[PDB]
């Protein structure tokens, strides 16, 4: 359709490229994170709306501001080669002539000339051959289409000449520490998420329950999702989102709504087609702003019994401790174990119900898996990291279920936080006390 407004900042491009190369040149990192590669080969095929979070895409977004479909990048220690359509290369040519360049910028331009196009691919092979033949890749990434099939026809027959190694962790290290702009983006996204949860979802939810509305979870979810199409909604002075560029706003995923005895605390949960029940309701939702993700999740209780309120209040208290533990220098695995330790000390009865991880890092990727908050993770938190923290209890048993009543429930809290040297900043903070989220008919 229409011509978009692409802001590709030269300075940011070279700053970030320099960060990557600096890590790569580090004796230690170069060996362990980059696995001794002399080049890094990244491809992107056909754009896929339903697959936004791959490392290859993230690299584009981080360096350029946007995914470039049907493009190949070959990183070398002081060069970046970008092989893309001549029509896309128009947006890139300014990078080649930037003052404080972090590397040579080598733009190879595809045209209608099929033979010349083939030669461009052949140049990439030539470059790799002139190296130690160790090539860093993102092995998980899924791609398809005409561009990729062309490349495959050229690369696959010669691939055995090369040692392909996983350079994922090398990029992960660089993405992990958010700069001022990136933190601003995540904070913006977070603000939208909390506004929608607090100022739309809760109002709708409590009304539906009070009025005995018949509505499926997926129908409620779709309703809430459609809100992104309503610019007037975001512009309501109450929401205090006046500064947000709505054109750069997207959903991270389809909001997850659960009730009526069927729960799933995994981020992979899909809203079902069951009728909304006024018992224990979980909702998770998150916006993406300028390609940076956020996430928020809450529990709502309707005519809860004393045990449900007690357990929920315990969750809130544990989450407070989790925040306190999440600071610069903290070993990730230690954080999980400390939280487990609080459970075992104070509510050992709840151990079997406890989540196995407490979330992960968040940014351009919805999930930065290297920062997964479980017991095993040896990595250390650093100021500037951002975490999508999730804590909960599942398969909690109701002592006196009514004929018409759920046998089990779950409890959940999710917030997006920025790591500092002290207490973290909770971007998605909103009142979460039992009294604030409990409703009595």
- In DSSP notation, 241-295 reads -TT--GGGEEESSPPEEE-TT----STT----SSBP-SSEEEEEE-EEETTEE--
Neighbour-count burial of 237, counting CB atoms closer than 10 A to its CB (0-12 exposed, 13-18 middle, 19+ buried): exposed
Map out the domains of the chain as residue ranges. 1-175, 176-441
Q: Over the Cα atoms of the chain, what is R_g?
A: 24
CATH 3.40.350.10 fits 1-175, yes or no: yes
Closest CA to 419 of 143, 183, 145: 183
The DSSP code for 199 is: I
- Name 283's Cβ contacts closer than 8 Å, sequence gap at least 6: 197, 201, 205, 255, 256, 257, 258, 297, 298, 300
C-alpha distance from residue 306 to each of 154, 281, 301, 422 (Å): 67, 17, 11, 35
Yes or no: say if 367 and 53 are a contact pair by the CB < 8 Å rule.
yes
Neighbour-count burial of 160, counting CB atoms closer than 10 A to its CB (0-12 exposed, 13-18 middle, 19+ buried): exposed
- φ, ψ of residue 402 to 5 degrees: the values are -75, 160
- Name 132's Cβ contacts closer than 8 Å, sequence gap at least 6: 36, 38
Yes or no: say if 200 and 224 are a contact pair by the CB < 8 Å rule.
yes
Tokens in use for 254? 């389809």
Tokens in use for 100? 């404080």
Dihedral sign computed on CA atoms, order 200, 203, 207, 210: positive
Residue with tokens 């993230």: 58
Cβ neighbour number for residue 130 with a 10 Å cutoff = 11
- Name 116's Cβ contacts closer than 8 Å, sequence gap at least 6: none
- Name 229's Cβ contacts closer than 8 Å, sequence gap at least 6: none
Yes or no: say if 166 and 137 are a contact pair by the CB < 8 Å rule.
yes
- What topology is assigned to 176-441 in CATH? Creatine Amidinohydrolase (3.90.230)
The distance of Cα 102 from the centroid of its chain, to the nearest Å, equals 27
Closest CA to 428 of 408, 410, 411, 414: 414
- Name 90's Cβ contacts closer than 8 Å, sequence gap at least 6: none
- Resolution of the deposited coordinates, in angstroms? 1.8
- Name 118's Cβ contacts closer than 8 Å, sequence gap at least 6: 150, 154
Strand partners, 361: 368, 387
Tokens in use for 18? 């320099």
Instruction: Return d(Cα 102, Cα 99) in angstroms, integer.
Output: 9
Closest CA to 299 of 122, 140, 434, 113: 434
Residue 29's SS3 state is helix
Closest CA to 312 of 293, 298, 322: 298
Q: How many residues does the chain have?
A: 441
Residue 132's SS3 state is coil
Note the maximum CA span of the chain.
Answer: 75
Instruction: Return d(Cα 365, Cα 374) in angstroms, integer.
Output: 19
Instruction: Return d(Cα 2, Cα 177) in angstroms, integer.
Output: 35
The H or E element that residue 359 is part of is: strand 359-361
The DSSP code for 167 is: -
Instruction: Return d(Cα 343, Cα 109) in angstroms, integer.
Output: 59
The H or E element that residue 55 is part of is: helix 55-63
Tokens in use for 368? 């930065």
Tokens in use for 312? 């929920």
- Name 434's Cβ contacts closer than 8 Å, sequence gap at least 6: 301, 309, 312, 313, 316
Closest CA to 384 of 440, 327, 310, 316: 327
The H or E element that residue 315 is part of is: helix 306-325
- φ, ψ of residue 123 to 5 degrees: the values are -60, -40
Yes or no: say if 322 and 389 are a contact pair by the CB < 8 Å rule.
yes
C-alpha distance from residue 6 to each of 50, 173, 182, 202 (Å): 22, 27, 17, 36
Yes or no: say if 259 and 277 are a contact pair by the CB < 8 Å rule.
yes
């Amino acid at each position: 359709g229409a011509m978009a407004e692409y802001e590709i900042d030269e300075i940011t491009f070279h700053k970030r490229l320099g960060i990557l190369l600096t890590s790569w040149k580090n004796e230690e990192d170069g060996k362990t994170l980059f696995q001794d590669c002399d080049s890094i080969l990244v491809t992107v095929g056909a754009h896929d709306d339903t697959n936004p979070y791959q490392k290859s895409t993230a690299l584009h977004t981080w360096l350029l501001g946007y995914e470039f479909p049907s493009t190949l990048i070959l990183l070398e220690k002081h060069r970046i080669t970008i092989l893309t359509s001549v029509n896309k290369a128009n947006m890139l040519t300014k990078l080649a002539e930037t003052k404080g360049a972090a590397a040579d910028v080598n733009i190879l331009k595809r045209t209608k000339d099929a033979e010349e196009n083939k030669k461009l691919f052949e140049k990439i092979i030539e470059y790799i051959r002139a190296t130690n033949k160790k090539v860093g890749v993102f092995p998980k990434d899924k791609t398809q289409g005409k561009f990729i099939n062309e490349w495959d026809s050229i690369f696959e027959p010669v691939k055995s000449e090369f040692n392909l190694v996983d350079a994922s962790l090398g990029l992960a290290k660089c993405l992990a520490i958010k700069d001022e702009q990136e933190l601003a983006n995540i904070k913006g996204a977070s603000r939208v998420s909390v506004a929608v949860m607090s100022k739309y979802f809760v109002d709708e939810l409590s009304t539906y329950i009070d009025q005995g509305k018949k509505i499926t979870h997926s129908k409620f979810s779709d309703q809430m999702e459609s809100l992104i199409d309503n610019e007037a909604f975001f512009q309501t002075k109450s929401l205090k989102l006046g500064d947000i560029d709505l054109d750069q706003l997207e959903w991270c995923y389809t909001p997850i709504i659960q009730s009526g005895g069927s729960y799933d605390l995994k981020p992979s949960a899909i809203t079902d087609d069951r009728n909304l029940h006024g018992d224990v309701v979980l909702c998770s939702l998150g916006f993406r702003y300028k390609s940076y993700c956020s996430n928020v999740g809450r529990t709502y209780l309707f005519d809860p019994d004393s045990e449900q309120q007690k357990n929920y209040s315990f969750l809130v208290a544990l989450q407070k401790k989790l925040f306190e533990y999440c600071r610069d220098g903290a070993v990730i695995g230690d954080i999980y174990t400390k939280i487990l330790g609080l459970i075992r000390a104070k509510r050992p009865d709840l151990e079997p119900n406890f989540v196995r991880n407490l979330g992960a890092g968040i940014g351009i990727e919805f999930r930065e898996s290297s920062l997964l908050v479980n017991a095993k993770n040896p990595r250390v938190l650093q100021a500037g990291m951002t975490l999508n923290l999730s804590i909960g209890f599942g398969n909690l048993i109701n002592p006196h279920p009514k004929n018409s009543q759920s046998k089990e429930y779950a409890l959940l809290l999710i917030d997006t936080i920025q790591i500092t040297r002290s207490d973290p900043i909770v971007f998605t903070d909103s009142p979460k006390a039992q009294g604030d989220i409990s409703y009595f008919f």
